[PDB]
Design an enzyme around this catalytic site. Structure first.
Site, PDB file in Angstrom:
ATOM      1  N   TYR B  41       0.824  -1.211   0.000  1.00 35.09           N
ATOM      2  CA  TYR B  41       0.000   0.000   0.000  1.00 35.09           C
ATOM      3  C   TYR B  41       0.862   1.266   0.000  1.00 35.09           C
ATOM      4  O   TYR B  41       1.802   1.397   0.788  1.00 35.09           O
ATOM      5  CB  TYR B  41      -1.009   0.006   1.172  1.00 35.09           C
ATOM      6  CG  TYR B  41      -2.155  -1.013   1.075  1.00 35.09           C
ATOM      7  CD1 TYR B  41      -2.851  -1.420   2.213  1.00 35.09           C
ATOM      8  CD2 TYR B  41      -2.542  -1.561  -0.147  1.00 35.09           C
ATOM      9  CE1 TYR B  41      -3.901  -2.340   2.131  1.00 35.09           C
ATOM     10  CE2 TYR B  41      -3.580  -2.482  -0.238  1.00 35.09           C
ATOM     11  CZ  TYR B  41      -4.258  -2.868   0.897  1.00 35.09           C
ATOM     12  OH  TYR B  41      -5.290  -3.782   0.786  1.00 35.09           O
ATOM     13  N   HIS B 105      -2.033 -12.054   0.511  1.00 39.47           N
ATOM     14  CA  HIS B 105      -2.850 -11.038  -0.159  1.00 39.47           C
ATOM     15  C   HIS B 105      -3.624 -11.627  -1.332  1.00 39.47           C
ATOM     16  O   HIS B 105      -4.791 -11.280  -1.534  1.00 39.47           O
ATOM     17  CB  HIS B 105      -1.936  -9.920  -0.650  1.00 39.47           C
ATOM     18  CG  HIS B 105      -2.589  -8.575  -0.787  1.00 39.47           C
ATOM     19  ND1 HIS B 105      -1.948  -7.401  -0.435  1.00 39.47           N
ATOM     20  CD2 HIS B 105      -3.794  -8.207  -1.284  1.00 39.47           C
ATOM     21  CE1 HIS B 105      -2.735  -6.373  -0.699  1.00 39.47           C
ATOM     22  NE2 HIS B 105      -3.863  -6.833  -1.207  1.00 39.47           N
TER      23      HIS B 105
HETATM   24  N1  LIG Z   1      -7.962  -7.715   0.706  1.00 34.86           N
HETATM   25  C1  LIG Z   1      -7.902  -7.071  -0.456  1.00 34.86           C
HETATM   26  O1  LIG Z   1      -7.497  -7.706  -1.645  1.00 34.86           O
HETATM   27  C2  LIG Z   1      -8.345  -5.642  -0.483  1.00 34.86           C
HETATM   28  C3  LIG Z   1      -8.239  -4.884   0.690  1.00 34.86           C
HETATM   29  N2  LIG Z   1      -8.581  -3.554   0.736  1.00 34.86           N
HETATM   30  C4  LIG Z   1      -8.922  -2.920   2.056  1.00 34.86           C
HETATM   31  O2  LIG Z   1     -10.290  -2.564   2.134  1.00 34.86           O
HETATM   32  C5  LIG Z   1     -10.422  -1.261   2.641  1.00 34.86           C
HETATM   33  C6  LIG Z   1     -11.750  -0.699   2.224  1.00 34.86           C
HETATM   34  O3  LIG Z   1     -11.789  -0.771   0.836  1.00 34.86           O
HETATM   35  P1  LIG Z   1     -12.096   0.585   0.065  1.00 34.86           P
HETATM   36  O4  LIG Z   1     -12.377   0.256  -1.347  1.00 34.86           O
HETATM   37  O5  LIG Z   1     -11.085   1.590   0.472  1.00 34.86           O
HETATM   38  O6  LIG Z   1     -13.511   0.930   0.726  1.00 34.86           O
HETATM   39  P2  LIG Z   1     -14.768   1.455  -0.141  1.00 34.86           P
HETATM   40  O7  LIG Z   1     -15.292   0.451  -1.090  1.00 34.86           O
HETATM   41  O8  LIG Z   1     -15.795   1.920   0.814  1.00 34.86           O
HETATM   42  O9  LIG Z   1     -14.188   2.687  -0.969  1.00 34.86           O
HETATM   43  C7  LIG Z   1     -13.542   3.722  -0.272  1.00 34.86           C
HETATM   44  C8  LIG Z   1     -13.466   4.916  -1.197  1.00 34.86           C
HETATM   45  O10 LIG Z   1     -14.797   5.352  -1.498  1.00 34.86           O
HETATM   46  C9  LIG Z   1     -14.914   6.757  -1.322  1.00 34.86           C
HETATM   47  N3  LIG Z   1     -15.616   7.198  -0.077  1.00 34.86           N
HETATM   48  C10 LIG Z   1     -15.288   6.890   1.228  1.00 34.86           C
HETATM   49  N4  LIG Z   1     -16.155   7.500   2.061  1.00 34.86           N
HETATM   50  C11 LIG Z   1     -17.040   8.192   1.319  1.00 34.86           C
HETATM   51  C12 LIG Z   1     -18.130   8.979   1.672  1.00 34.86           C
HETATM   52  N5  LIG Z   1     -18.444   9.147   2.949  1.00 34.86           N
HETATM   53  N6  LIG Z   1     -18.884   9.589   0.698  1.00 34.86           N
HETATM   54  C13 LIG Z   1     -18.537   9.411  -0.628  1.00 34.86           C
HETATM   55  N7  LIG Z   1     -17.456   8.619  -0.981  1.00 34.86           N
HETATM   56  C14 LIG Z   1     -16.715   8.018  -0.020  1.00 34.86           C
HETATM   57  C15 LIG Z   1     -13.459   7.184  -1.288  1.00 34.86           C
HETATM   58  O11 LIG Z   1     -13.025   7.142  -2.610  1.00 34.86           O
HETATM   59  P3  LIG Z   1     -12.618   8.463  -3.368  1.00 34.86           P
HETATM   60  O12 LIG Z   1     -12.167   9.444  -2.318  1.00 34.86           O
HETATM   61  O13 LIG Z   1     -11.422   8.151  -4.232  1.00 34.86           O
HETATM   62  O14 LIG Z   1     -13.822   8.898  -4.179  1.00 34.86           O
HETATM   63  C16 LIG Z   1     -12.703   6.091  -0.580  1.00 34.86           C
HETATM   64  O15 LIG Z   1     -11.303   6.146  -0.812  1.00 34.86           O
HETATM   65  C17 LIG Z   1      -9.227  -0.562   2.061  1.00 34.86           C
HETATM   66  O16 LIG Z   1      -8.986   0.692   2.626  1.00 34.86           O
HETATM   67  C18 LIG Z   1      -8.169  -1.618   2.337  1.00 34.86           C
HETATM   68  O17 LIG Z   1      -7.678  -1.604   3.671  1.00 34.86           O
HETATM   69  C19 LIG Z   1      -8.805  -2.897  -0.447  1.00 34.86           C
HETATM   70  C20 LIG Z   1      -8.768  -3.540  -1.689  1.00 34.86           C
HETATM   71  C21 LIG Z   1      -8.424  -4.988  -1.835  1.00 34.86           C
END
Ligand SMILES: NC(=O)C1=CN([C@@H]2O[C@H](COP(=O)(O)OP(=O)(O)OC[C@H]3O[C@@H](n4cnc5c(N)ncnc54)[C@H](OP(=O)(O)O)[C@@H]3O)[C@@H](O)[C@H]2O)C=CC1
Ligand SMILES: NC(=O)C1=CN([C@@H]2O[C@H](COP(=O)(O)OP(=O)(O)OC[C@H]3O[C@@H](n4cnc5c(N)ncnc54)[C@H](OP(=O)(O)O)[C@@H]3O)[C@@H](O)[C@H]2O)C=CC1
Ligand SMILES: [Ca+2]
Lengths: 323, 323
Positions: B41, B105
């Site tokens: 990350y 991962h």
């Molecule tokens: N195990 C794996 O293979 C995976 C693990 N992960 C983990 O999962 C966690 C969560 O996944 P992630 O995709 O980040 O979570 P989400 O699916 O919820 O997407 C988060 C993104 O959505 C947007 N967002 C967040 N809050 C709001 C809000 N209140 N209103 C509007 N848009 C919002 C932002 O994107 P933006 O600001 O860019 O619009 C943010 O970066 C990651 O942080 C990570 O730790 C992630 C991917 C793969």
């Protein structure tokens, strides 16, 4: 390129002894080799019919290969004792010393899988069967079984028999990857979705016509209705029928033929890995009709797209490949 | 009832050191405990930020539980040597002697899973981590791994981290059954589909507005577009938004809130089994917004039906939970 196996389920049920013998003669006279039956099919009349066709099954001087199964439904389990009773009976009915393929018909969620496999090994050691098979097990249950056999030195399953057709493709996502990894070959059942993909029914028949068939007037009629008789399925058949007339016109093939040709030419099945299609039929006129379609060539891409579009229509309401 | 874990992916990328520390303070001040990061990350800046927050991680005088991962992308494999390099670096960055959870991962299709697990065991024996985890493995790959560990007396994985949200439910069919059988708890990522389910985008932005975010102007922008930016997805968000106004009116909650509440109250996640939701954010204003929704109560049944209807819309075009 993908193999063809004879589905012997309706033998003893819809097809009498004579009709069934006629169908087996036809099947073999097209150069095909293997037959699928089961302990439970038509209260055992299926296995008994085949056993009385003088095919000298299980012998060395024998071209035909035979497949049977043991289930954990009704009184029966896949515990060691039941497992034996079911196979030994299948043998006595089929009038043979061993079967070429022996499936666990379905998961026995009340018996640890370890107990069953050890028993399968012990039965293989006794030469009651050549190859072990699985059917209706989840991908992950297969992965468990194979790993347990490697590590306990038991016979590995080498064939999976699963629900697969043009409008039913759940197996593709996880099962296939898994099977290729552990080296199992896949045999498709329900290739015409019980006949639904022949296009001979219309959705509105459940309320009125109710034609005596796979979907009406038998013990399992309702199950098959819950599996395939959905409104979105009939949309999808219509979509394919329109695509057929569009790309082929007057010369358009029956979509019995189209549906089978999809399995042979455009599915994930691969002749290379020994995959097969198990054909179903309730009559001789149906078998000849189907065996023809097996040998027919591939389909225009616009039709394969329509099948794909029809699958996307029903994918959300798709039946599970596993019990 | 289902737990909440802090997604530390955007730390070092969209959030600077100060913003990330602020977010961690906020997260812990709601009584939550566990944080998810990874070797890869933000080129390692994520793990380094967290390591410099003086949380005395991995220590005994430590309330916070930390999670990291090793990947088989780029130069890296999950072969023993690489596996060590990745963890040992994660530790040196996080400024701790051990991590509380250590994931594989993704599958390393070029390295026999046996080699990896033995190496994981040897690293657990050395006290570099407490619990082993999997992510993006197919249900059947998990079944293989767990069976190999039982029989080789290696540490079993106990946590699975998977792609799960209101419009993405492929995990439900096979993975969950499998996880409950082998006793793994499930941690959901992509709970807002990268922000798509916040409802802030409209499909027609790909051609014009292209707002700098998860879906635009970064290395992984296009992957996320191929994953969630489909026409049928936007239909479904609209369907939920109409259902929200209908059942709640003026008092209707944001569908950031609605989407999160679906995970916590109406999904297959179960607090009882230790399941969790990993929350994502690119700002503090977003985290406070999300942490609120986490504590909010369940939704009217008419809205849960609408989410379900939206999922049925996109199920056919749904991304695989496994690489
Ligand atoms: N195990 C794996 O293979 C995976 C693990 N992960 C983990 O999962 C966690 C969560 O996944 P992630 O995709 O980040 O979570 P989400 O699916 O919820 O997407 C988060 C993104 O959505 C947007 N967002 C967040 N809050 C709001 C809000 N209140 N209103 C509007 N848009 C919002 C932002 O994107 P933006 O600001 O860019 O619009 C943010 O970066 C990651 O942080 C990570 O730790 C992630 C991917 C793969
Ligand atoms: N263990 C398992 O998981 C399963 C295994 N199988 C095995 O696989 C085989 C295939 O399954 P099955 O359901 O039979 O596959 P199909 O989808 O092909 O169903 C066959 C049915 O389709 C109809 N049909 C057959 N030929 C024609 C034709 N030419 N024109 C129009 N309709 C036709 C008949 O229905 P109708 O009577 O309505 O006319 C027939 O009974 C079985 O025979 C059995 O051996 C079958 C079921 C379960
Ligand atoms: Ca409709």
């Amino acid at each position: 390129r993908p193999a063809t196996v004879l589905g012997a389920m309706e033998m003893g049920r819809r097809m009498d002894a004579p009709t069934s013998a006629a169908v087996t003669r036809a099947f073999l006279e097209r150069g095909h080799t293997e037959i699928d039956t089961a302990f439970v099919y038509s209260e055992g009349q299926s296995e008994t019919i085949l056993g009385g066709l003088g095919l000298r099954l299980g012998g060395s001087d024998c071209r035909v290969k035979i497949d049977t199964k043991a289930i954990p439904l009704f009184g029966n389990s896949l515990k060691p004792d039941s497992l034996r009773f079911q196979l030994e009976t299948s043998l006595k009915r089929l009038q043979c010393p061993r079967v070429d393929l022996f499936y666990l018909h379905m998961p026995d969620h009340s018996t640890p899988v370890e107990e069953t496999l050890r028993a399968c090994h012990q039965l293989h050691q006794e030469g009651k069967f050549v190859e072990l098979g699985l059917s209706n097990y989840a991908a992950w249950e297969v992965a468990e079984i194979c790993t347990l056999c490697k590590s306990n030195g038991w016979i590995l399953p080498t064939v999976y028999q699963g629900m697969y057709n043009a409008i039913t493709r759940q197996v593709e996502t996880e099962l296939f990857p898994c099977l290729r990894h552990f080296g199992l070959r896949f045999y498709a059942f329900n290739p015409l979705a019980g006949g639904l993909l022949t296009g001979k029914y219309k959705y509105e028949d459940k309320d009125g016509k109710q034609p005596v068939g796979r979907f009406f007037g038998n013990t399992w009629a309702e199950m098959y209705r819950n599996r395939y008789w959905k409104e979105h399925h009939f949309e999808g058949i219509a979509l394919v029928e329109k695509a057929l007339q569009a790309a082929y016109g007057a010369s358009a093939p029956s979509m019995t033929s189209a549906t089978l040709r999809w399995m042979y030419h455009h599915s994930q099945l691969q002749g290379a890995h020994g995959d097969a299609v198990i054909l179903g039929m309730s009559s001789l006129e149906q078998l000849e009709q189907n065996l023809a379609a097996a040998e027919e060539g591939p389909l225009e891409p616009a039709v394969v797209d329509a099948f794909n579009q029809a699958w996307h229509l029903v994918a959300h309401e798709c039946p599970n490949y596993f019990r």
